[PDB]
Design an enzyme around this catalytic site. Structure first.
Site, PDB file in Angstrom:
ATOM      1  N   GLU A 265       0.836   3.879   1.575  1.00 60.42           N
ATOM      2  CA  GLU A 265       1.172   4.361   2.894  1.00 60.42           C
ATOM      3  C   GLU A 265       2.381   3.609   3.429  1.00 60.42           C
ATOM      4  O   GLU A 265       3.260   4.211   4.059  1.00 60.42           O
ATOM      5  CB  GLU A 265      -0.027   4.214   3.830  1.00 60.42           C
ATOM      6  CG  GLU A 265      -1.208   5.132   3.501  1.00 60.42           C
ATOM      7  CD  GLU A 265      -2.135   4.570   2.438  1.00 60.42           C
ATOM      8  OE1 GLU A 265      -3.202   5.171   2.197  1.00 60.42           O
ATOM      9  OE2 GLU A 265      -1.796   3.542   1.817  1.00 60.42           O
TER      10      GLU A 265
ATOM     11  N   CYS B 103      -5.967   2.887   4.940  1.00 60.73           N
ATOM     12  CA  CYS B 103      -6.737   1.761   5.498  1.00 60.73           C
ATOM     13  C   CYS B 103      -6.373   1.567   6.979  1.00 60.73           C
ATOM     14  O   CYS B 103      -5.369   2.126   7.470  1.00 60.73           O
ATOM     15  CB  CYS B 103      -6.483   0.467   4.709  1.00 60.73           C
ATOM     16  SG  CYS B 103      -5.004  -0.421   5.268  1.00 60.73           S
TER      17      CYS B 103
ATOM     18  N   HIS C  16       0.826  -1.197   0.000  1.00 58.99           N
ATOM     19  CA  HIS C  16       0.000   0.000   0.000  1.00 58.99           C
ATOM     20  C   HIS C  16       0.860   1.247   0.000  1.00 58.99           C
ATOM     21  O   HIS C  16       1.987   1.231   0.505  1.00 58.99           O
ATOM     22  CB  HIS C  16      -0.995  -0.003   1.168  1.00 58.99           C
ATOM     23  CG  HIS C  16      -2.066  -1.037   1.035  1.00 58.99           C
ATOM     24  ND1 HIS C  16      -3.022  -1.249   2.005  1.00 58.99           N
ATOM     25  CD2 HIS C  16      -2.340  -1.914   0.037  1.00 58.99           C
ATOM     26  CE1 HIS C  16      -3.837  -2.213   1.613  1.00 58.99           C
ATOM     27  NE2 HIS C  16      -3.441  -2.638   0.423  1.00 58.99           N
TER      28      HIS C  16
HETATM   29 ZN   LIG Z   1      -3.305   0.163   3.731  1.00 64.43          ZN
END
Ligand SMILES: [Zn+2]
EC number: 3.5.4.38
Length: 184
Positions: free
Chosen positions: A63, A92, A61
């Site tokens: 992030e 998330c 991801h």
């Molecule tokens: Zn995530």
């Protein structure tokens, strides 16, 4: 970042239709111990790493990729820094705890996350955003100002000024109401 990609990814029209990626632009500014001013350190952008048999099998991801690159910045470890992120989707649940961990164990990093649309899986995402704020991160919704900033800073506009899509302000207002309710 090419203009179609920016406009397609950072458009704040609620629809979760096609935008399966998360783009993240970041800016780093040193705190300066004497005066009130911030010093330009670095900037860049990135997106998630789709699941791949020759790479991250379970996917990576945006992030998590962002946290992967900070070590390569080599910020003086005993200085205070302002880190700002502009993301097309909010983090998330899992990436929120990871970012909350980072800022909790560092103290010398002020994290401000501006997001275009909020990725709320209706499950633990809301809790994740509350955790990040609890950790001291500023989480906010992108408005005309943040969109224009990113356009001018991270897009190959080739001289073209930023042109807001219709309803930008409207969706920006609505998303702000939802985030404020999620947090409190
Ligand atoms: Zn995530």
């Amino acid at each position: 970042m090419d203009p179609p990609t920016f406009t397609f990814n950072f458009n704040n029209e609620p629809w979760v239709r096609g935008r399966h990626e998360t783009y993240l632009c970041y800016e780093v500014e040193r705190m300066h111990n004497d005066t009130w001013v911030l010093l330009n350190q670095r900037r860049g952008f990135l997106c998630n790493q789709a699941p791949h048999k020759h790479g991250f099998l379970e996917g990576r991801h945006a992030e998590l990729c962002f946290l992967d690159v900070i070590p390569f910045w080599k910020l003086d470890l005993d200085q205070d820094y302002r880190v700002t992120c502009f993301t097309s989707w909010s983090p998330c649940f899992s990436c929120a705890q990871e970012m909350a961990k980072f800022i909790s164990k560092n103290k010398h990093v002020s994290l401000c996350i501006f997001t275009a649309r909020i990725y709320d899986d209706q499950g633990r995402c809301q809790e994740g955003l509350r955790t990040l704020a609890e950790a001291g991160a500023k989480i906010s919704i992108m408005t005309y100002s943040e969109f224009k900033h990113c356009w001018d800073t991270f897009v190959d506009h080739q001289g073209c000024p930023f042109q807001p899509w219709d309803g930008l302000d409207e969706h920006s207002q609505d998303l702000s109401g939802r985030l404020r309710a999620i947090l409190q």
